[PDB]
């Protein structure tokens, strides 16, 4: 019902009843419509009009639905009416099917942010990070002028947008209109346990974890050989899928 | 643009800092810093509104005119509906006289509503 | 007949005429609401066909 | 990806240049130069054909 | 009225006046559109024309 406005769906119904009452009045009044379908005796005075009010309504409905009816005007005064109703229901049917192509395939939904620089321009969506993190520390030391715009928004309102934890950053995305900046290994866990959040951009930088040791500790080599042994064997992929599991969300639409 | 002129860092008449900034503004320009600073501050919410999308179900402002050329077609058809009443009496002119007394019969027999003959 | 009634339905489905038309207004409402059906099905079909 | 591993600037066992490059590679990374150099050489004729 | 140029809307109107005229002209001198009316009609030598 969408490709025509709800007054236009009424203006066609008021024209299908409008023309089909005018076509009845003209056919009853015109003398050339009266015909005798008596081939045996042509002067036996069996003049007749097909256009009763139930037949005049059926010409209007029959020409509107593009199937066509058995009724054809043969007086010229009813043949302009039958010729102008065929043009009206040529433009209505064509404008419907040329607007119905638009109201079926347009997109899923475009997000207002699609990257980090689109998030820097749109100052409606406020955004922050943890105020004790290396996510904050990256944007503070950066000078790449996409992240100078993002830190100038966050350093103005460090009370407002910057939060204390990852948990208080997700609750302000779920409730408020907010664009919290996590690290990509705890976006993958959140977007399985809660199928209403998403990851907007790609990756801003590349980092990685690591078992920290004091300065000059003897264990920084015996751990990094033991991590590589757990990675060639495939243990670090067995332990990731065990915990970052596959709880299940719809595909992408 | 009605004319063209530009932003000069003003100095008093006789300042030695005139040439030292004239060379310096060229140094930020040949490197590209004057384009970095302009596209950081003259950037912002670029106007989405112009583009398209998603909408414009056809209203009376869109289709519109076939409710006019229809009504002009039915008004014209009533004008040729009385024109076939007048010429039928002119083909009835070789019977009674030319006119009303033969015309008032056809005015009646249409109104009896399937009394056909 | 049941052969003639099914050739109305197939005929009005593929947008072509048939030699039989419904009189008797209770059968014109069937023949008029099957015309609005096949209008919307084919207009929805050829809209996605590109 | 079948696995995940990375490119290490090799040093002999006991080099003092190990930590001085370990800090240095982090310095090019936090500034963004390792993404500048990758998107200059792994750029090129991006395949049009798919569209 | 825009998706055809205003000379096309004239050329399809001079085609309706051109094809329907030559359909009338050919139906005058086509000796097979002189059919038999009155579907019983023992011949009676009276033929007519729809056009
Ligand atoms: C006797 C038989 C009669 C027919 C009976 C048939 C039965 C059914 C017949 C019709 C049913 C539907 C009614 C038709 C109009 C509906 C539109 C409407 O009302 O709203 C419109 C009014 O429209 C106008 O003001 C335009 C003026 C034309 C009025 C009719 C002229 C016909 C005669 C003249 C020719 C004579 C020539 C003679 C021969 C050569 C709103 O105005 P808008 O500007 O369009 O809106 C823009 C929206 N915007 C502001 C947001 C941008
Ligand atoms: C297919 C076979 C051939 C058919 C031959 C005829 C085809 C050639 C026909 C037209 C040729 C067009 C040339 C342009 C000149 C007039 C245009 C114009 O000035 O518009 C004006 C009027 O226009 C109208 O409102 C409609 C006038 C014609 C409608 C009736 C046609 C008769 C068809 C049936 C009989 C056919 C005759 C033959 C049988 C008896 C605009 O004025 P407006 O719209 O009122 O105001 C703007 C609306 N607004 C206020 C909201 C903004
Ligand atoms: C702007 C206007 C404002 C109002 C002014 C007043 C209106 C003035 C308009 C019209 C005058 C009204 C009276 C006309 C006489 C009616 C009889 C008739 O139609 O002849 C015959 C048609 O067969 C033909 O031979 C028609 C000849 C060509 C005319 C139509 C041209 C078509 C082009 C289209 C362009 C439009 C055409 C324009 C007009 C030419 C039928 O005659 P019959 O009775 O059936 O007898 C046959 C015997 N039988 C019954 C056994 C079969
Ligand atoms: C181009 C072709 C022209 C064809 C002629 C035009 C005919 C006029 C056709 C429709 C006009 C009326 C609807 C106006 C449109 C606005 C939307 C609307 O009101 O829908 C309202 C519902 O109401 C309906 O949807 C049912 C309307 C009647 C169905 C059409 C019958 C056709 C008759 C054939 C005539 C011949 C048969 C002979 C006698 C039987 C509500 O809005 P909604 O959006 O639907 O949301 C609710 C849905 N939800 C469940 C998703 C929540
Ligand atoms: C006859 C009885 C009565 C009928 C009455 C009703 C009929 C009404 C009939 C016609 C109504 C009016 C016609 C409108 C003109 C259409 C052409 C046109 O616009 O295209 C171009 C004209 O350039 C040409 O293409 C000219 C080619 C002429 C070749 C012969 C034509 C006759 C075909 C018949 C053979 C007979 C023998 C066959 C025997 C089996 C426009 O040029 P352009 O804009 O620059 O576009 C670039 C063109 N380019 C890429 C090609 C360069
Ligand atoms: C559907 O849209 C609404 C509004 O666009 C959103 O849900 C609410 O969004 C407002 C933000 O203006 C929050 O304050 C509310 O708390 C939200 N509602 C709830 C129940 O949390 C959201 O985009 C969508 N809501 C869904 C999918 O439930
Ligand atoms: O912080 S690092 O030690 N050095 C920077 N990088 C790569 C340059 C992306 C990476 C990539 C993945 C890591 F696990 C660690 C690091
Ligand atoms: O005012 S100016 O120094 N001299 C005039 N012009 C050019 C004539 C356009 C221009 C053009 C661009 C400028 F930035 C400055 C000037
Ligand atoms: O070979 S590593 O030094 N240790 C193993 N890993 C992570 C387990 C994937 C990674 C990940 C990214 C790297 F760049 C290097 C390494
Ligand atoms: C959970 C927090 C605050 C930690 C986790 N990794 C970063 C770190 O340990 O430096 C922080 C993430 C962030 O700042 O978004
Ligand atoms: C996302 O939020 C909605 C409403 O706020 C609710 O259905 C649920 O918490 C989430 N959706 C899913 C599918 O988990």
PDB file of C-alpha atoms in Angstrom, chain A residues 2-5 7-8 11-12 15 18-19 22 26 28-32 34 45 47-49 75-78 80-81 84-85 87-88 91-92 95 99 103 106 117 121-123 145-146 149, chain B residues 36 39-40 43-46 53-64 66-67 69-70 73-74 76-78 80-85 87-88 91 106-107 109-111 113-114 116-117:
ATOM      1  CA  UNK A   2       3.057   2.263   0.555  1.00  0.00           C
ATOM      2  CA  UNK A   3       4.077   3.558  -2.985  1.00  0.00           C
ATOM      3  CA  UNK A   4       1.030   5.832  -3.137  1.00  0.00           C
ATOM      4  CA  UNK A   5       0.009   8.215  -0.365  1.00  0.00           C
ATOM      5  CA  UNK A   7      -5.084  10.167   0.093  1.00  0.00           C
ATOM      6  CA  UNK A   8      -4.168   8.988  -3.411  1.00  0.00           C
ATOM      7  CA  UNK A  11      -8.675   9.643  -4.839  1.00  0.00           C
ATOM      8  CA  UNK A  12      -8.558   6.591  -7.117  1.00  0.00           C
ATOM      9  CA  UNK A  15     -12.477   8.476  -9.389  1.00  0.00           C
ATOM     10  CA  UNK A  18     -16.846   9.092 -10.093  1.00  0.00           C
ATOM     11  CA  UNK A  19     -16.236   8.173 -13.738  1.00  0.00           C
ATOM     12  CA  UNK A  22     -20.727   9.822 -15.260  1.00  0.00           C
ATOM     13  CA  UNK A  26     -23.867   9.781 -20.618  1.00  0.00           C
ATOM     14  CA  UNK A  28     -28.306   6.556 -20.783  1.00  0.00           C
ATOM     15  CA  UNK A  29     -28.590  10.046 -22.352  1.00  0.00           C
ATOM     16  CA  UNK A  30     -26.706   9.483 -25.638  1.00  0.00           C
ATOM     17  CA  UNK A  31     -28.919   8.141 -28.446  1.00  0.00           C
ATOM     18  CA  UNK A  32     -26.155   6.389 -30.397  1.00  0.00           C
ATOM     19  CA  UNK A  34     -28.974   2.235 -28.075  1.00  0.00           C
ATOM     20  CA  UNK A  45     -37.445  -2.411 -31.910  1.00  0.00           C
ATOM     21  CA  UNK A  47     -32.959  -1.311 -28.893  1.00  0.00           C
ATOM     22  CA  UNK A  48     -30.890  -1.870 -25.778  1.00  0.00           C
ATOM     23  CA  UNK A  49     -28.231  -0.332 -23.532  1.00  0.00           C
ATOM     24  CA  UNK A  75     -21.288   6.046 -28.817  1.00  0.00           C
ATOM     25  CA  UNK A  76     -18.570   8.673 -29.152  1.00  0.00           C
ATOM     26  CA  UNK A  77     -19.813  10.566 -26.078  1.00  0.00           C
ATOM     27  CA  UNK A  78     -19.054   7.479 -23.968  1.00  0.00           C
ATOM     28  CA  UNK A  80     -14.015   9.800 -24.782  1.00  0.00           C
ATOM     29  CA  UNK A  81     -14.877   8.693 -21.212  1.00  0.00           C
ATOM     30  CA  UNK A  84      -9.612   9.020 -20.889  1.00  0.00           C
ATOM     31  CA  UNK A  85     -10.126   6.417 -18.172  1.00  0.00           C
ATOM     32  CA  UNK A  87      -5.081   6.936 -19.829  1.00  0.00           C
ATOM     33  CA  UNK A  88      -5.691   7.639 -16.132  1.00  0.00           C
ATOM     34  CA  UNK A  91      -0.393   6.471 -15.394  1.00  0.00           C
ATOM     35  CA  UNK A  92      -1.618   5.158 -12.014  1.00  0.00           C
ATOM     36  CA  UNK A  95       3.550   5.219 -11.254  1.00  0.00           C
ATOM     37  CA  UNK A  99       7.652   3.585  -7.041  1.00  0.00           C
ATOM     38  CA  UNK A 103      10.089   0.638  -1.499  1.00  0.00           C
ATOM     39  CA  UNK A 106      17.059   0.481  -0.512  1.00  0.00           C
ATOM     40  CA  UNK A 117      36.766  10.267  11.461  1.00  0.00           C
ATOM     41  CA  UNK A 121      32.812  15.160  12.860  1.00  0.00           C
ATOM     42  CA  UNK A 122      29.482  14.181  14.432  1.00  0.00           C
ATOM     43  CA  UNK A 123      29.593  16.028  17.757  1.00  0.00           C
ATOM     44  CA  UNK A 145      44.784  15.341  13.433  1.00  0.00           C
ATOM     45  CA  UNK A 146      41.912  12.892  13.303  1.00  0.00           C
ATOM     46  CA  UNK A 149      39.899  16.312  17.130  1.00  0.00           C
TER      47      UNK A 149
ATOM     48  CA  UNK B  36      46.119  20.625   7.271  1.00  0.00           C
ATOM     49  CA  UNK B  39      40.748  21.053   6.824  1.00  0.00           C
ATOM     50  CA  UNK B  40      40.761  20.610  10.599  1.00  0.00           C
ATOM     51  CA  UNK B  43      35.652  20.604   8.607  1.00  0.00           C
ATOM     52  CA  UNK B  44      32.636  19.603  10.706  1.00  0.00           C
ATOM     53  CA  UNK B  45      29.153  18.270  10.165  1.00  0.00           C
ATOM     54  CA  UNK B  46      29.065  18.191   6.379  1.00  0.00           C
ATOM     55  CA  UNK B  53      16.706   8.355   0.157  1.00  0.00           C
ATOM     56  CA  UNK B  54      14.205   5.800   1.291  1.00  0.00           C
ATOM     57  CA  UNK B  55      11.015   7.763   0.768  1.00  0.00           C
ATOM     58  CA  UNK B  56       8.691  10.041  -1.256  1.00  0.00           C
ATOM     59  CA  UNK B  57       5.502   8.034  -1.605  1.00  0.00           C
ATOM     60  CA  UNK B  58       3.628   9.700  -4.445  1.00  0.00           C
ATOM     61  CA  UNK B  59       1.229  12.379  -3.275  1.00  0.00           C
ATOM     62  CA  UNK B  60      -0.902  15.020  -4.938  1.00  0.00           C
ATOM     63  CA  UNK B  61       2.226  17.100  -5.542  1.00  0.00           C
ATOM     64  CA  UNK B  62       3.850  14.215  -7.461  1.00  0.00           C
ATOM     65  CA  UNK B  63       1.245  12.571  -9.695  1.00  0.00           C
ATOM     66  CA  UNK B  64      -1.293  15.356  -9.539  1.00  0.00           C
ATOM     67  CA  UNK B  66      -4.044  13.053 -14.191  1.00  0.00           C
ATOM     68  CA  UNK B  67      -6.813  14.134 -11.851  1.00  0.00           C
ATOM     69  CA  UNK B  69      -6.687  15.815 -17.457  1.00  0.00           C
ATOM     70  CA  UNK B  70      -9.321  13.278 -16.430  1.00  0.00           C
ATOM     71  CA  UNK B  73     -11.779  14.754 -20.473  1.00  0.00           C
ATOM     72  CA  UNK B  74     -15.151  14.243 -18.810  1.00  0.00           C
ATOM     73  CA  UNK B  76     -15.289  17.711 -22.899  1.00  0.00           C
ATOM     74  CA  UNK B  77     -17.290  14.487 -23.181  1.00  0.00           C
ATOM     75  CA  UNK B  78     -20.431  16.091 -21.755  1.00  0.00           C
ATOM     76  CA  UNK B  80     -20.074  16.142 -27.115  1.00  0.00           C
ATOM     77  CA  UNK B  81     -22.921  14.414 -25.268  1.00  0.00           C
ATOM     78  CA  UNK B  82     -25.287  17.313 -25.940  1.00  0.00           C
ATOM     79  CA  UNK B  83     -23.831  17.525 -29.442  1.00  0.00           C
ATOM     80  CA  UNK B  84     -25.170  14.076 -30.260  1.00  0.00           C
ATOM     81  CA  UNK B  85     -28.570  15.005 -28.861  1.00  0.00           C
ATOM     82  CA  UNK B  87     -27.665  16.072 -34.280  1.00  0.00           C
ATOM     83  CA  UNK B  88     -30.073  13.210 -33.560  1.00  0.00           C
ATOM     84  CA  UNK B  91     -31.659  13.438 -38.217  1.00  0.00           C
ATOM     85  CA  UNK B 106     -35.818  11.574 -26.575  1.00  0.00           C
ATOM     86  CA  UNK B 107     -35.585  13.562 -23.325  1.00  0.00           C
ATOM     87  CA  UNK B 109     -37.473   7.850 -23.138  1.00  0.00           C
ATOM     88  CA  UNK B 110     -33.962   7.921 -21.676  1.00  0.00           C
ATOM     89  CA  UNK B 111     -35.458   8.688 -18.259  1.00  0.00           C
ATOM     90  CA  UNK B 113     -34.808   3.541 -17.286  1.00  0.00           C
ATOM     91  CA  UNK B 114     -35.056   0.299 -19.365  1.00  0.00           C
ATOM     92  CA  UNK B 116     -36.426   0.192 -23.833  1.00  0.00           C
ATOM     93  CA  UNK B 117     -39.199   0.270 -26.455  1.00  0.00           C
TER      94      UNK B 117
END
